[PDB]
Amino acid sequence: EYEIIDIGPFTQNLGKWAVDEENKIGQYGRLTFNKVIRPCMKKTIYENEGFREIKGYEYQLYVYASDKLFRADISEDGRKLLRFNGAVPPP
Incomplete structure (x- = not known):
């Protein structure tokens, strides 16, 4: 269940991390970070086993990089960084 969050400093820093991770590959060339726009979605990733319930969190972000939009x-x-693909701006 992806819930919607607001695009604060944490959301902006998640997009900075993704742009820098794609930059590590060099596939998309040198991307410069611009802004993470709305909507930003968050989903809880629960453990598959063990004594801890919450394993982590998954984020779906719309980020501008090099004046172009990407889904991360x-x-x-x-x-x-599971996915990074050019994206059309959402409604």
Whole structure:
């Protein structure tokens, strides 16, 4: 269940991390961070086993980088950039 959050400093810093992670690959070239826009979605990732309930969180962000928009799926327990693809601006 992806719930919607507000685009504060934490959301802006999550998009900065994703842009810097895609920059590590060099696939999209040198991307410069601009802004994470709305909507930003958050979902709780529960553990599959063990004595801890919450494993981490997954974020779906719309980020501008190099004056272009990209969709970024991020997991933070541990930090993973699962998806980064050009995106059309949402309604």
